[PDB]
C-alpha cells in the first residue's frame, strides 16, 4: 500500500505499512513497531503535527 516515514529515536527511516504489527496513536504522537524481513525489527514514531496527515490516516484506521 504505502511506505511510512518515521524517526526511530532520531534515525529517519521509511518502512512499509504492511510490515507494521501494531499502531498506537496518542493524539499528539503515533508510536508503532515494524518487523522487517531482513532480520531486523524496530520501532517507529511519527509526529501527528510534523508529518503529512495523509500518512497519518493510514496508520490509525477505524477499529485498529
Amino acid at each position: 500500500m504505502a511506505t511510512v516515514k518515521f524517526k526511530y529515536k532520531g534515525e529517519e527511516k521509511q518502512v512499509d505499512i504492511s510490515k507494521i504489527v501494531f499502531v498506537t496513536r496518542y493524539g499528539k504522537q503515533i508510536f508503532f513497531r515494524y518487523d522487517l524481513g531482513g532480520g531486523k525489527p524496530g520501532f517507529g514514531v511519527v509526529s501527528e503535527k510534523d508529518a503529512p496527515k495523509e500518512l497519518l490516516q493510514k496508520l490509525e484506521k477505524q477499529k485498529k
Partner: protein, 57 residues
C-alpha cells in the same frame, strides 16, 4: 523511576501490554528503542509499553 499511564490502551498483540490510566510500570529496558519493555507494578506482567501513553513520575 516509575512511569504512570496517562491514557488507557488495550494491547493488539501479546507483544504490547494492556494498561489503564494510572498504571505504574517498572521500566526494564528503555534502551530497546521507542517502545520499552516494562513490568507492571500492579499485575506484574511483562510487555512493551508505548512511551507516548506514559509519563515519568
Amino acid at each position: 523511576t516509575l512511569f504512570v499511564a496517562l491514557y488507557d490502551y488495550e494491547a493488539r498483540t501479546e507483544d504490547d501490554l494492556s494498561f489503564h490510566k494510572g498504571e505504574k510500570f517498572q521500566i526494564l529496558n528503555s534502551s530497546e528503542g521507542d517502545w520499552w519493555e516494562a513490568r507492571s507494578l500492579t499485575t506484574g506482567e511483562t510487555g512493551y509499553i508505548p512511551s507516548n501513553y506514559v509519563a515519568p513520575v
